[PDB]
Design an enzyme around this catalytic site. Structure first.
Site, PDB file in Angstrom:
ATOM      1  CB  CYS A  82      -0.874  -0.040   1.088  1.00 10.05           C
ATOM      2  SG  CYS A  82      -1.742   1.656   1.316  1.00 10.05           S
ATOM      3  NE  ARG A 130       2.205   0.619   3.615  1.00 12.45           N
ATOM      4  CZ  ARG A 130       3.415   0.037   3.593  1.00 12.45           C
ATOM      5  NH1 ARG A 130       3.758  -0.459   4.726  1.00 12.45           N
ATOM      6  NH2 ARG A 130       4.232  -0.041   2.806  1.00 12.45           N
ATOM      7  CD1 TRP A 132      -7.053   9.016  -2.279  1.00 11.04           C
ATOM      8  CD2 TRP A 132      -7.943   9.362  -0.452  1.00 11.04           C
ATOM      9  NE1 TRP A 132      -6.139   9.674  -1.244  1.00 11.04           N
ATOM     10  CE2 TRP A 132      -6.778   9.872  -0.245  1.00 11.04           C
ATOM     11  CE3 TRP A 132      -9.018   9.513   0.756  1.00 11.04           C
ATOM     12  CZ2 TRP A 132      -6.321  10.463   1.145  1.00 11.04           C
ATOM     13  CZ3 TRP A 132      -8.365  10.032   1.847  1.00 11.04           C
ATOM     14  CH2 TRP A 132      -7.211  10.638   2.117  1.00 11.04           C
ATOM     15  CD  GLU A 149      -5.713   2.052  -7.320  1.00 11.70           C
ATOM     16  OE1 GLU A 149      -6.040   0.871  -7.242  1.00 11.70           O
ATOM     17  OE2 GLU A 149      -5.930   2.904  -6.492  1.00 11.70           O
TER      18      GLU A 149
HETATM   19  C1  HEM Z   1      -6.219   6.682   1.787  1.00 18.17           C
HETATM   20  C2  HEM Z   1      -6.180   6.248   0.442  1.00 18.17           C
HETATM   21  C3  HEM Z   1      -5.234   5.086   0.028  1.00 18.17           C
HETATM   22  C4  HEM Z   1      -4.524   5.214  -1.059  1.00 18.17           C
HETATM   23  C5  HEM Z   1      -4.530   6.199  -2.153  1.00 18.17           C
HETATM   24  C6  HEM Z   1      -4.235   3.697  -1.122  1.00 18.17           C
HETATM   25  C7  HEM Z   1      -3.738   3.467  -2.434  1.00 18.17           C
HETATM   26  C8  HEM Z   1      -3.380   2.014  -2.640  1.00 18.17           C
HETATM   27  C9  HEM Z   1      -2.914   1.420  -4.114  1.00 18.17           C
HETATM   28  C10 HEM Z   1      -2.671   2.304  -5.364  1.00 18.17           C
HETATM   29  C11 HEM Z   1      -3.000   0.216  -3.836  1.00 18.17           C
HETATM   30  C12 HEM Z   1      -2.544  -0.938  -5.470  1.00 18.17           C
HETATM   31  C13 HEM Z   1      -3.959  -1.831  -5.445  1.00 18.17           C
HETATM   32  C14 HEM Z   1      -3.706  -2.568  -6.763  1.00 18.17           C
HETATM   33  O1  HEM Z   1      -2.768  -2.436  -7.407  1.00 18.17           O
HETATM   34  O2  HEM Z   1      -4.368  -3.613  -6.874  1.00 18.17           O
HETATM   35  C15 HEM Z   1      -3.332  -0.252  -2.680  1.00 18.17           C
HETATM   36  C16 HEM Z   1      -3.209  -1.512  -1.890  1.00 18.17           C
HETATM   37  C17 HEM Z   1      -3.582  -1.956  -0.909  1.00 18.17           C
HETATM   38  N1  HEM Z   1      -4.097  -0.952   0.208  1.00 18.17           N
HETATM   39 FE1  HEM Z   1      -4.109   1.070   0.010  1.00 18.17          FE
HETATM   40  N2  HEM Z   1      -4.361   3.146  -0.099  1.00 18.17           N
HETATM   41  C18 HEM Z   1      -5.096   3.829   0.617  1.00 18.17           C
HETATM   42  C19 HEM Z   1      -6.142   3.305   1.754  1.00 18.17           C
HETATM   43  C20 HEM Z   1      -5.865   2.063   2.281  1.00 18.17           C
HETATM   44  C21 HEM Z   1      -6.957   1.557   3.470  1.00 18.17           C
HETATM   45  C22 HEM Z   1      -7.741   2.361   4.210  1.00 18.17           C
HETATM   46  C23 HEM Z   1      -6.299   0.318   3.721  1.00 18.17           C
HETATM   47  C24 HEM Z   1      -6.821  -0.472   4.759  1.00 18.17           C
HETATM   48  C25 HEM Z   1      -7.433  -0.085   5.847  1.00 18.17           C
HETATM   49  C26 HEM Z   1      -5.770   0.025   2.534  1.00 18.17           C
HETATM   50  C27 HEM Z   1      -4.866  -1.320   2.462  1.00 18.17           C
HETATM   51  C28 HEM Z   1      -4.309  -1.738   1.177  1.00 18.17           C
HETATM   52  C29 HEM Z   1      -4.056  -3.092   1.067  1.00 18.17           C
HETATM   53  C30 HEM Z   1      -4.167  -4.250   1.991  1.00 18.17           C
HETATM   54  C31 HEM Z   1      -3.561  -3.337  -0.251  1.00 18.17           C
HETATM   55  C32 HEM Z   1      -2.822  -4.461  -0.939  1.00 18.17           C
HETATM   56  C33 HEM Z   1      -4.313  -4.805  -1.680  1.00 18.17           C
HETATM   57  C34 HEM Z   1      -3.918  -6.153  -2.328  1.00 18.17           C
HETATM   58  O3  HEM Z   1      -2.916  -6.895  -2.148  1.00 18.17           O
HETATM   59  O4  HEM Z   1      -4.593  -6.428  -3.359  1.00 18.17           O
HETATM   60  N3  HEM Z   1      -5.315   1.275   1.742  1.00 18.17           N
HETATM   61  N4  HEM Z   1      -3.459   0.878  -1.820  1.00 18.17           N
HETATM   62  C1  LIG Z   2      -9.864  -4.181 -11.397  1.00 17.77           C
HETATM   63  C2  LIG Z   2     -10.790  -3.373 -10.499  1.00 17.77           C
HETATM   64  O1  LIG Z   2     -10.097  -2.668  -9.505  1.00 17.77           O
HETATM   65  C3  LIG Z   2     -10.681  -2.168  -8.333  1.00 17.77           C
HETATM   66  O2  LIG Z   2     -11.805  -2.453  -8.155  1.00 17.77           O
HETATM   67  N1  LIG Z   2      -9.922  -1.629  -7.498  1.00 17.77           N
HETATM   68  C4  LIG Z   2      -8.337  -1.467  -7.624  1.00 17.77           C
HETATM   69  C5  LIG Z   2      -7.578  -2.227  -6.666  1.00 17.77           C
HETATM   70  C6  LIG Z   2      -8.119  -1.804  -5.090  1.00 17.77           C
HETATM   71  N2  LIG Z   2      -7.597  -0.340  -5.114  1.00 17.77           N
HETATM   72  C7  LIG Z   2      -7.587   0.519  -3.785  1.00 17.77           C
HETATM   73  C8  LIG Z   2      -7.813   0.080  -2.924  1.00 17.77           C
HETATM   74  C9  LIG Z   2      -7.599   0.883  -1.573  1.00 17.77           C
HETATM   75  C10 LIG Z   2      -8.078   0.448  -0.202  1.00 17.77           C
HETATM   76  C11 LIG Z   2      -7.420   2.214  -1.744  1.00 17.77           C
HETATM   77  C12 LIG Z   2      -6.850   2.846  -3.008  1.00 17.77           C
HETATM   78  N3  LIG Z   2      -6.925   1.926  -4.168  1.00 17.77           N
HETATM   79  C13 LIG Z   2      -9.538  -1.546  -5.321  1.00 17.77           C
HETATM   80  C14 LIG Z   2     -10.298  -0.968  -6.369  1.00 17.77           C
END
Ligand code: HEM
Ligand SMILES: CCOC(=O)N1CCC(Nc2cc(C)ccn2)CC1
Ligand code: HEM
Ligand SMILES: CCOC(=O)N1CCC(Nc2cc(C)ccn2)CC1
Ligand SMILES: C[C@H](O)[C@H](O)[C@H]1CNc2nc(N)[nH]c(=O)c2N1
Ligand SMILES: C[C@H](O)[C@H](O)[C@H]1CNc2nc(N)[nH]c(=O)c2N1
Ligand SMILES: [Zn+2]
Lengths: 416, 416
Positions: A113, A116, A285, A290
């Site tokens: 993520c 963070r 958000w 993405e």
């Molecule tokens: C506040 C705005 C946030 C932004 C801009 C952000 C952005 C991102 C992005 C760009 C990814 C990549 C997703 C992908 O490539 O599939 C990601 C993954 C992830 N985020 Fe964040 N994040 C945010 C908030 C959060 C929150 C609130 C949580 C949890 C409480 C979180 C938990 C995670 C986790 C666990 C992953 C890994 C998902 C996976 O392995 O498929 N994120 N986040």
């Molecule tokens: C291919 C479809 O992908 C999705 O729906 N998403 C892309 C992967 C995942 N992105 C996220 C998740 C979070 C929690 C914050 C910012 N970005 C959730 C949304």
């Protein structure tokens, strides 16, 4: 003692000591999408007490150990209370404050993520009292409404009942709360999101009515108390979408593109102090890339790259012309421009990268480390233009943590 | 039995069995630039025979084991000959054909190289008879001339004498055969390549005369037979350069940029059948992004990004405008356009990526695997637009192999 980490742009050196607190066996298989080390599977029996108790104590110590001014008395009292609860019930219930702390720490501990820096800003919805699928649906609708907030996106997580014996798991079968359907049309062409063809068929098999559109929001497939999954259409009024426009190319809106405003992971498992929460959807958000790069430009997704190239009058038949680089950038511009114009929160990948660098810096200072997966943290475009690309990182699994799970349809035992 | 590998774009699955032949301990520290596992340090004593002999046999078996129609007799004869040579001399000399095979296999086994589809096309210069620095210089000049070939770049490698006792190592102190100097000017500004400030000072300390230019080719710092390094200016007639122009922006040439045509790694060590060659410079041809993105856009290098942004009239004070994405692409276009116009070999990153995918496919079919470092293989821009980004990869160290070495100035014992 510590692992040396270097930033090849500034030359700055960092010492990682936090990795010592890493857990079980990890994976060089760094580029594997879903390794077993990041997955926490199903069970058919309760967690052995000899394993649970030690993890519980560890967590309680971490929790009370996070306060500026210690509360020694409560600390010991809580340790005692938890032990007794485990001996008398075979498990234990986290207090609301402990849960809130756990969800933020798991986020803080998510290596993949990039957002963070926002880890301490998270709304927690306590749904541990939930019992039916209908109630799950209601909690999820409340979450979607709160998070969307008319465009001013707010991060939130809804925690459903923890796993008991593994036979009464609460699970959201969807990968995300909001996602578009994919259909295999009669003429052989694919309509909508090609990556959701199988799940869409599953929804149809369960009674959902297909609309055969390019952007049909999929229904929630909810599993409660280990029972068969039930289908629930998401009320359209709760789904905020952004129509895609380009600040210069009038023809861009002609592509008829749009995307949802809410990015929410729906199928992960929260691990904390020995407990496991199989259902805990959360959202933040969007980062522009993405949608602009993965959703719209991945070949197995909406794949609009070539069409945009033609419209721009580029040499789409000559790779060396770098037409793909020119097109993807204009698409990223359209995405950011549209979200901004429609007052919907979103962050570009450059700002996000610098944001993460500041966070990483804060983390090494605060606790001597920051688990990070370089492969996921570097944006899908302009890699070395971002600071994260030049930063060496250490990837490890701490606790609390958000794990992947085995797809439910592969392990679910149907009642009928 | 095998490791499952998946391509998330096509869904294609591959089974890796080649990793079983991996060597010693590796590193999750996947994003570390120079890990000990990829480094082969200095020695002060010959390689123990109990270690050398087994590696020698293994290599000889691999060599004869590569022929379509086996030559069993020669095979056994060679095995016998090598053993005797090791018992009677404490080491052994590879035949020319064995060496050629070794250099190509080491290239084939380089995890961080995206151009490996060309692995069997390599000119080998046998300089194992070399004895003085002056002779080293002559061999290197011959190599540069052959490889440059008036713009039609040819891949080549020059193999100097193998390590004996570790006290008579042949070493090129330069990181690359051709590289520009960096100077700390009186007014405090940096001129030239900021990343070579220290090495430039070393050259100056050794007698080289600084010219204080933006693109001054550094001299070769050659160490022969373990003796102190000697400085040799590269004859300017041997250095082909490309002046940078943009196909549309007339003002681009006003930036006064240029770069050398020959990309040559000068400080790595070739390991084969127990032997170590501390001096073996090699070259291929450039991939556009190395110059356009890393050399020109890295902040600690020539850092021209902002200047190009202004000239393009972009909002360089607003990150979200994605001006950096627009600028870097025009710079990449300038690089490719200029090399092409001046008839100098170069390959864009898209074509290179597809090229590597075909190679990887060939490798899994030919020998069940292909060591690959995703972090180095994905281009510095347009990551997910290239196919390599969506391909899971396994990174491991085989033999023969090209290793990093400890910087010579850190371990060299000066005579005076
Ligand atoms: C506040 C705005 C946030 C932004 C801009 C952000 C952005 C991102 C992005 C760009 C990814 C990549 C997703 C992908 O490539 O599939 C990601 C993954 C992830 N985020 Fe964040 N994040 C945010 C908030 C959060 C929150 C609130 C949580 C949890 C409480 C979180 C938990 C995670 C986790 C666990 C992953 C890994 C998902 C996976 O392995 O498929 N994120 N986040
Ligand atoms: C291919 C479809 O992908 C999705 O729906 N998403 C892309 C992967 C995942 N992105 C996220 C998740 C979070 C929690 C914050 C910012 N970005 C959730 C949304
Ligand atoms: C034919 C054209 C070739 C192309 C286009 C190609 C391209 C590349 C590129 C882009 C890199 C990344 C360099 C960096 O980021 O610093 C690289 C690394 C590497 N290449 Fe190739 N290559 C080619 C030929 C060769 C040859 C002939 C050899 C050896 C015989 C070779 C050995 C390697 C090795 C060992 C590395 C790693 C260098 C390091 O770790 O610093 N390459 N190559
Ligand atoms: C920062 C200076 O970088 C360089 O001089 N180079 C960049 C790194 C390296 N690139 C290469 C090497 C080879 C052998 C083939 C293609 N590309 C050698 C040239
Ligand atoms: C094979 C490789 O692991 C895969 O393509 C990765 C690369 N980096 C990524 N990074 C992010 N943020 N999200 C992803 O889905 C991926 N996928
Ligand atoms: C920290 C990280 O390992 C470093 O920035 C990397 C990333 N990927 C790379 N890839 C290539 N081809 N060359 C490089 O120098 C680097 N550097
Ligand atoms: Zn690893």
């Amino acid at each position: 003692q510590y692992v040396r980490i270097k930033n090849w742009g500034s030359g700055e050196i960092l010492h990682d000591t936090l990795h010592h607190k890493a857990t079980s066996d990890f994976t060089c298989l760094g580029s594997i999408m879903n390794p077993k080390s990041l997955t926490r599977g199903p069970r058919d029996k309760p967690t052995p007490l000899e394993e649970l108790l030690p993890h519980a104590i560890e967590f309680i110590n971490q929790y009370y150990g996070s306060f500026k001014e210690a509360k020694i008395e409560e600390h010991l009292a809580r340790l005692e209370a938890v032990t007794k609860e485990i001996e008398t019930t075979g498990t234990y219930q986290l207090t609301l404050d402990e849960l809130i702390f756990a969800t933020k720490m798991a986020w803080r501990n998510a290596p993949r993520c990039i957002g963070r820096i926002q880890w301490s800003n998270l709304q927690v919805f306590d749904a541990r009292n939930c019992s039916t699928a209908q109630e799950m649906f209601q909690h999820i609708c409340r979450h979607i409404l709160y998070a969307t907030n008319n465009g001013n996106i707010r991060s939130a997580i809804t925690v459903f009942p923890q796993r008991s014996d593994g036979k009464h798991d609460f699970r959201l079968w969807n990968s995300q709360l909001i996602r578009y359907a994919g259909y295999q049309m009669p003429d052989g062409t694919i309509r909508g999101d090609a990556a959701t063809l199988e799940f869409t068929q599953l929804c149809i098999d369960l009674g959902w009515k297909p609309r055969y559109g390019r952007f049909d929001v999929l229904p929630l497939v909810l599993q409660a108390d280990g029972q068969d999954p039930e289908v629930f259409e998401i009320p359209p009024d709760l789904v905020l979408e952004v129509t895609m426009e380009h600040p210069k190319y009038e023809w861009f809106q002609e592509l008829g593109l749009k995307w949802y405003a809410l990015p929410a992971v729906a199928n992960m498992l929260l691990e904390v102090g020995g407990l496991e929460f199989p259902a805990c959807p959360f959202n933040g958000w969007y980062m522009g890339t993405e949608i602009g790069v993965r959703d719209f430009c991945d070949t197995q997704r909406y794949n609009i790259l070539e069409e945009v190239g033609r419209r721009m009058g580029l040499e789409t038949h000559t790779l060396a012309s770098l037409w793909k680089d020119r097109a993807v950038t204009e698409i990223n511009v359209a995405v950011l421009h549209s979200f901004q114009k429609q007052n919907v929160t979103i962050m570009d990948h450059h700002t996000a990268s610098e944001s993460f660098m500041k966070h990483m810096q804060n983390e090494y200072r605060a606790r001597g480390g920051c688990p990070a997966d370089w492969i996921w943290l570097v944006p899908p475009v302009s890699g070395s233009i971002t600071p994260v690309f030049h930063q060496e990182m250490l990837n490890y699994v701490l606790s609390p943590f958000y794990y992947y799970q085995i797809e439910p349809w592969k392990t679910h035992i149907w009642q009928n």
